[PDB]
Amino acid sequence: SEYELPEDPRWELPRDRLVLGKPLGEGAFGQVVLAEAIGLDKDKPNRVTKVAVKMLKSDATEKDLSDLISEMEMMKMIGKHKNIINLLGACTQDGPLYVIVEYASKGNLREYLQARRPPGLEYSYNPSHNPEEQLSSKDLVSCAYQVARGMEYLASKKCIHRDLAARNVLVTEDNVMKIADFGLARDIHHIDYYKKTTNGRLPVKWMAPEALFDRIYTHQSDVWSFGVLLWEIFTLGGSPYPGVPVEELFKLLKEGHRMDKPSNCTNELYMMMRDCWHAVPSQRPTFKQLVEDLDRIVALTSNQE
Numbered sequence: 001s002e003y004e005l006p007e008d009p010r011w012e013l014p015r016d017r018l019v020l021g022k023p024l025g026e027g028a029f030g031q032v033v034l035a036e037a038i039g040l041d042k043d044k045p046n047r048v049t050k051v052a053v054k055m056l057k058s059d060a061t062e063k064d065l066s067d068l069i070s071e072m073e074m075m076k077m078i079g080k081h082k083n084i085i086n087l088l089g090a091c092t093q094d095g096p097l098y099v100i101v102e103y104a105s106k107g108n109l110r111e112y113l114q115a116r117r118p119p120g121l122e123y124s125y126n127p128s129h130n131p132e133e134q135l136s137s138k139d140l141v142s143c144a145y146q147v148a149r150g151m152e153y154l155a156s157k158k159c160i161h162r163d164l165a166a167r168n169v170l171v172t173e174d175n176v177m178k179i180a181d182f183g184l185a186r187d188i189h190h191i192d193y194y195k196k197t198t199n200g201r202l203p204v205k206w207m208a209p210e211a212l213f214d215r216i217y218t219h220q221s222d223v224w225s226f227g228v229l230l231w232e233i234f235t236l237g238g239s240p241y242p243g244v245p246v247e248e249l250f251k252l253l254k255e256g257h258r259m260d261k262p263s264n265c266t267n268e269l270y271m272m273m274r275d276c277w278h279a280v281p282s283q284r285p286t287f288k289q290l291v292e293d294l295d296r297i298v299a300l301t302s303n304q305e
């Protein structure tokens with residue numbers, strides 16, 4: 001239980017200043033909740049901010065604490081960007097480790113897009129019982145731009161996400177896109193391809209071929225994944241490679257088969273997808289060029305549609 005937790009007075013927040021609310025989600029030997037932090041900014045001690053706090057579960061082992069510290073310390077090294085989930089504070093003293101980060105009210109991007117789906121031929125059915133206002137064409141390109149910006153920053157800081165999907169992007173109340181779970185430590189063991197997360201997702205579909213076969217992870221493998229993410233944006237939370245099992249995906253990609261253009265998508269944007277989906281990693285575009293291009297398309301894309 002003790003354990004030597006590093007104290008960092010700049011990130012340190014007192015526990016009586018944090019009021020723990022409802023759970024946000026459940027991870028590996030750790031759980032996230034909503035909370036209200038009183039006086040997050042020290043020259044404004046009387047203000048409350050909604051935050052997300054990560055804490056270990058009952059079944060958590062020594063390995064899990066080291067991971068949690070690693071994740072926290074990793075966010076310190078990467079620093080702040082608006083388009084990623086940022087470290088706010090932590091409680092290392094007088095109790096269990098709490099890691100306080102930015103809160104995105106509107107949930108993950110996959111559920112955000114699926115709830116904003118218009119009825120029609122171009123998109124699938126809206127799963128949400130309380131559907132929201134539909135998104136414009138500019139909003140969607142803008143969404144892609146933000147994710148790229150955030151990924152561009154993580155790239156400059158030498159962070160490789162290695163799982164990048166609409167699920168791993170979160171949306172705030174201000175409808176700012178923020179990359180989530182970027183600071184994870186890579187497992188030393190081999191991964192089970194058929195294995196699903198707590199949500200029932202297969203990550204293999206976002207993996208570049210080199211990562212899928214030879215388990216090689218680069219910034220370029222994230223670009224491939226960003227192609228899959230782009231596809232998800234313009235399918236409004238569509239499932240990649242529908243009705244394709246793992247075994248069928250291995251062969252499909254080797255033969256050079258790629259996903260079909262989404263019903264509502266421009267050729268320029270589908271070319272961007274195909275560029276990220278390029279077999280040879282060196283021939284894929286960089287996030288730097290993806291930001292430069294998307295910045296241009298957003299201005300050109302009308303907000304009326």
Ligand SMILES: CCN1CCN(c2ccc(Nc3cc(N(C)C(=O)Nc4c(Cl)c(OC)cc(OC)c4Cl)ncn3)cc2)CC1
Binds near residue numbers: 099101102
């Ligand atoms: C319809 C059913 N839904 C209801 C909405 N729900 C939901 C999902 C996500 C959110 N928003 C969130 C979620 C999170 N989560 C889950 C979260 O884990 N945040 C977090 C992140 Cl992203 C980190 O990145 C490195 C690091 C962290 O601690 C080190 C944490 Cl704590 N952090 C901030 N906002 C809010 C609600 C998901 C289930």
